[PDB]
Structure formats: structure tokens, C-alpha cells
Design a protein around this ligand. Sequence first.
Ligand SMILES: [Mg+2]
Length: 87
Amino acid sequence: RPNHTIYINNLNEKIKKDELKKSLHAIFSRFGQILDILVSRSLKMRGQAFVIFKEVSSATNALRSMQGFPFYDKPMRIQYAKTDSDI
RNA sequence: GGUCACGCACAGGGCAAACCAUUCGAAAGAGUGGGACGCAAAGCCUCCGGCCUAAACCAUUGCACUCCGGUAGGUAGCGGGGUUACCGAUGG
Ligand SMILES: [Mg+2]
């Protein structure tokens, strides 16, 4: 079930792609080193985020420690990634 | 000569990329002035495709690692297509 990547859900879609990544990096980096943050604003990708960690353990902490956390007046919905491409 | 093509020139020369200044714009970008990388339609039109922007509105709770909702705006110097047009290689 666990994964290097965490699937953040229910995000404010009004945030600019640049700020969104930036803020997510500014909030999740305290859990572990981040490879890259995948954010896209297409109809299929809106309000969603993929945060890829070096270590699954750091992804595990980030999920458990910050599930529900209000972010741009909206509660984050963190769950594990189903499948993970890249490293 | 007219027309339909064509560009190896000729003559008048035309336009003006990047960058800078300034204006408008949420932005992409455009206007104007300076400036020239190039352009035989780099004149003009967003009909078809591509690409860029996403402030408002509409819709979307969506598992990606080609890239993508509508609506709107932009690019005609991204192609196609439409339309107009100067010169005329003893030119075809
Ligand atoms: Mg011609």
C-alpha cells in the first residue's frame, strides 16, 4: 500500500501552478527530501498534487502528520499513490 | 497587354525579429517610438489544425509522469486555407 509519492486531493484550484508547488514544498519539506512535486491544472489534474519523497518513511509521516490540514482555506486529503513511475 | 502560375533577377523599394523606452492588459500578448534577425506577400482575414495565456464565469473531487474542459483572449513571423497586390530574367 505505501509509496514514495503522496496523492494530495481537494486543493484550491485558483492557486497558480508556481505558488502551488512552492507552498507544497514549503510545507512538506520538513518530512524528508523531495525529488519533484507534480502539479498540473488540466481538467483531469485540477485540485491535485503528487509529492515524491526520497524515502517512503518520510512519505508515511507526511501523510499521517498532515491529513486534513487546512491549506488555502481548504482541507488537504492525503492518500498514497496507486502506482509510481520515475524513481 | 489581360489572366493563371512561377521566383534565377531587375527597378521602386516595403515590412520589421530579439532587445530597449513607453502605453494597455490578470496574463499570453498587443499598440506607439527607437532598432534590424529575417521575410516574394513578414499585406490583410482566426474558417481548419498546432501552440501560448487563464482574471471572470460555467463545469470538474479528478492517479498523473506526450499533451489536452467549456468560455474568452493571443500568435497571420507555427502551418493550412481565403482574399488583395509591385516588378517581369530575349522570363514560364
Ligand atoms: Mg508571390
